[PDB]
Design a protein around this ligand. Structure first.
Ligand SMILES: C[S@@+](CC[C@H](N)C(=O)[O-])C[C@H]1O[C@@H](n2cnc3c(N)ncnc32)[C@H](O)[C@@H]1O
Lengths: 198, 58, 426, 65
């Protein structure tokens, strides 16, 4: 007991220290050392590896670590999936975002928060067209965004003049039971006034 | 009967009775005869998404 | 059976003194069924904790929410929530002194006093449904609401702020009774509550049974506080299988079983009385507490903090903070969701938890919790003993004991949660 | 015989008769799109929608009664 517990403890501590220092090579060292110690299963360890990759933007290395932990391991803990989806949405890569979010279905994890994060990061990354794609395909799938995300996304769409999506999102917002306020109709009208057809 | 059906709001039956049970081809006739009077009865619909003025097939 | 008087809930079940869910007296349902109440797939059962609704059949899942009960508006009591007082069963004759008394209430502080006035008047109005229903309301000795408590109970409550709020409530009620049931009132008022006990009982019932909703009465969309004679028999849950809903065309309150949920014979049909209120609020208004209360709070002041996201994932908790829920994926319950909402915690975009410093924080917060438990004179299981055997089932005293016990049990679950979190962080 | 009481019940359930009938038409056309069994003999998609909806109301009616 206490031997295995202390080995696990010290190994995962030096792994987490490397991960916080964004040293995924180091984390791979500690993976090899824990395998030499026989501590083969460990979701925290591959989560450390994925976050070590993600904090330096190593999308390919993050996906490699995911392939490692799925192909020769066990179901990832939610933060692993959430962090890699965030790395997508913060980098772009929206197709990879949707692919992994759909892959989250097979874990039975809550897709809501991951989808919200993906949309928010895409909006922050000015990847608005594919942000609109993922949002509308989520809303048609019956998921409800957080109210802050509706308000932000409508406002940013209308600043972009993308009424073709702003009105659709407003219909999905109404269907989600978030009644459109004077702010949302002001945003819609800001673009409608441009058409010259009063 | 049109007045009664539209009073019931039962307007898909009204559409059936006035169109495909016999734009509708009789509206094509209407527009064509006005167009033969040298008046352009021009039908447009506005895209809610894009404000594009789509001209109807008339 | 559209007559008769004095139907009652057989007191064979409240005979727990020597040491469980018999059916309610069939007349209790009959008086509703004769008046267009309908219960679908549910049965009224009579425990020593009073009435409850239990499913009498397995109910298959359904795509929309499935009706389980219909109560017609004519049997309800209603007060407008906002100042212009109106009554939509309109029991009270125009110019009745009751309207003067009810106006003398504070528009928003004294809604319970208004409902108590209506309840008493509806016991005085012959051939109003509550003339018959009042027999099934808990009497002054068996109501759980602490408005019927005294210092003998509140000393056992050991929660001075809540003791003070209960004392203020009792003072307010008794001052209102003294002001508005003085000897100068008409007999048609003095006969409503000839003593303070009758009024404090009525207020305690009004508090413990007040539903409130936005409703539509014909054209008028409005806010009502109301009593529904068979939806008020639903027991509380923070994971309710049912919700109340309003139909305005025929003025029916439905009780609806949640969409997509299957339920089992003997399952208690419950509702979420007030979502997002701490146990002390449920004691203040309703007069009960529950240990799995997922909104409860703890007066932590520590600079020790735990990685919130890891605390969620180790317990498979999901959703936003307003939304936290647990799934099939087994000690995790509403108290662990409360823990995730309450522990001093830190979070960062993707940064992992320090496996050592999180154990240090676990130890520190566990010793804080231990000193909080040490601020009580007794452990949890001593109150469990004082409830598995009890001198006289004094309902207010037993409720105070249940409160204290629940809080200690909670902090215990906090300890166990931190232990299992550290162990399961591996 | 009885099916119109179910209709009235659902008319009483929904807050707009025209919106209810629109939702029934939508449900029927999506049924006849999500399933391509012919389903057009002695039982009809409208009655099926009414049956399924009254079963959601909890009432023991078979498909197309
Ligand atoms: C809406 S009233 C229902 C009346 C109650 N069934 C009776 O027998 O009078 C809620 C009351 O039921 C009890 N109660 C409420 N929530 C409860 C819970 N979660 N567990 C146990 N009892 C509860 C309390 O005594 C409270 O005063």
């Amino acid at each position: 007991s206490a031997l295995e517990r202390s080995l696990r403890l010290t190994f995962m501590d030096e792994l987490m220290e490397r991960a916080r220092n964004r040293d995924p090579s180091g984390v791979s060292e500690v993976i090899y050392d824990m395998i030499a110690a026989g501590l083969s299963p460990g979701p925290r360890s591959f989560h450390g590896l994925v976050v070590a990759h993600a904090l330096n933007g190593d999308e390919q290395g993050a996906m490699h670590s995911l392939r490692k932990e799925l192909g020769a391991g066990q179901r990832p803990l939610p933060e692993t999936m959430i962090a890699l989806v965030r790395l997508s949405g913060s980098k772009g890569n929206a197709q990879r975002g949707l692919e992994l979010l759909a892959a989250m279905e097979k874990l039975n994890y809550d897709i809501r928060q991951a989808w919200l994060i993906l949309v928010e990061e895409l909006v922050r990354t000015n990847h608005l067209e594919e942000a609109n794609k993922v949002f509308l395909k989520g809303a048609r799938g019956g998921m409800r965004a957080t109210d802050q995300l509706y308000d932000l996304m409508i406002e940013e769409d209308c600043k972009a003049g993308d009424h073709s999506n702003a009105l659709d999102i407003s219909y999905e917002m109404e269907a989600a039971g978030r009644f459109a306020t004077t702010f949302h109709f002001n945003c819609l009208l800001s673009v409608q006034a441009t058409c010259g057809i009063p | 009967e049109v007045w009664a059906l539209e009073g019931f709001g039962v307007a898909h039956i009204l559409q059936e009775m006035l169109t495909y049970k016999s734009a509708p081809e009789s509206f094509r006739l209407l527009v064509r005869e006005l167009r033969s009077l040298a008046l352009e009865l021009n039908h447009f619909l506005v895209s809610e998404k894009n404000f594009q003025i789509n001209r109807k097939e008339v | 059976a559209s007559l008769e008087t004095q139907p009652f809930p057989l007191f064979q079940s409240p005979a727990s003194e020597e040491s469980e869910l018999e059916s309610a007296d069939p007349d209790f349902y009959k008086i509703g069924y004769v008046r267009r109440v309908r219960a679908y797939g549910v049965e009224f059962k009579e425990g020593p904790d009073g009435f409850g609704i239990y499913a009498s059949k397995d109910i298959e899942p359904r795509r929309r929410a499935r009706v389980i009960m219909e109560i017609p508006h004519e049997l309800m009591i209603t007060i407008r929530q906002k100042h212009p007082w109106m009554f939509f069963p309109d029991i009270v004759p125009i110019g009745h002194p009751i309207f003067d008394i009810i106006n003398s209430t504070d528009p928003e502080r004294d809604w319970d006093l208004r409902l108590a006035c209506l309840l008493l008047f509806s016991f005085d109005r012959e051939d109003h449904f509550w003339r018959l229903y009042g027999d099934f309301l808990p009497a002054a000795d068996e109501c759980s609401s602490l408005l019927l408590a005294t210092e003998e109970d509140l000393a056992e409550l050991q929660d001075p702020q809540l003791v003070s709020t209960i004392r203020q409530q009792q003072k307010r009620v008794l001052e209102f009774w003294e002001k508005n049931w003085h000897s100068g009132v008409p007999l048609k008022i003095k006969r409503l509550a000839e003593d303070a006990e009758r009024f404090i009982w009525a207020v305690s019932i009004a508090q413990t049974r007040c539903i409130s909703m936005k409703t539509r009465i014909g054209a008028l969309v409005q806010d009502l506080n109301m009593m529904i004679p068979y939806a008020d028999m639903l027991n509380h849950s923070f994971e309710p299988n049912c919700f109340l809903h309003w139909r305005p065309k025929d003025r029916i309150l439905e009780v609806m079983s949640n969409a997509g949920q299957a339920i089992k014979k003997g399952e208690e049909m419950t509702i979420n009385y007030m979502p997002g209120q701490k146990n002390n609020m449920l004691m203040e208004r309703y007069g009960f507490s529950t240990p799995v209360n997922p909104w409860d709070a703890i007066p932590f002041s520590g600079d020790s903090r735990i990685h919130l996201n890891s605390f969620l994932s180790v317990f498979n908790i999901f959703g936003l903070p307003e939304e936290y829920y647990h799934d099939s994926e087994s000690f995790v319950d509403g108290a662990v969701i409360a823990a995730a909402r309450t522990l001093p915690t830190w979070s960062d975009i993707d940064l992992p938890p320090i496996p050592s410093a999180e154990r240090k924080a676990v130890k520190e917060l566990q010793d804080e919790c231990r000193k909080m438990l040490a601020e009580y004179p007794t452990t949890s299981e001593q109150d469990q003993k004082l409830l598995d055997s009890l001198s006289e089932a004094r309902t207010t005293f037993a409720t105070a004991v249940k409160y204290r016990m629940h809080r200690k049990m909670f902090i215990g679950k906090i300890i166990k949660a931190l232990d299992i979190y550290q162990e399961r962080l591996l | 015989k009885v099916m119109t009481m179910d209709i009235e019940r659902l008319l009483l359930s929904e807050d707009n008769r025209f919106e209810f009938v629109n939702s029934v038409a939508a449900e029927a056309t999506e049924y006849v799109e999500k399933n391509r069994d012919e389903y057009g003999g002695t039982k009809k998609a409208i009655f099926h929608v009414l049956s399924n909806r009254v079963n959601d109301l909890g009432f023991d009616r078979p498909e197309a009664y």
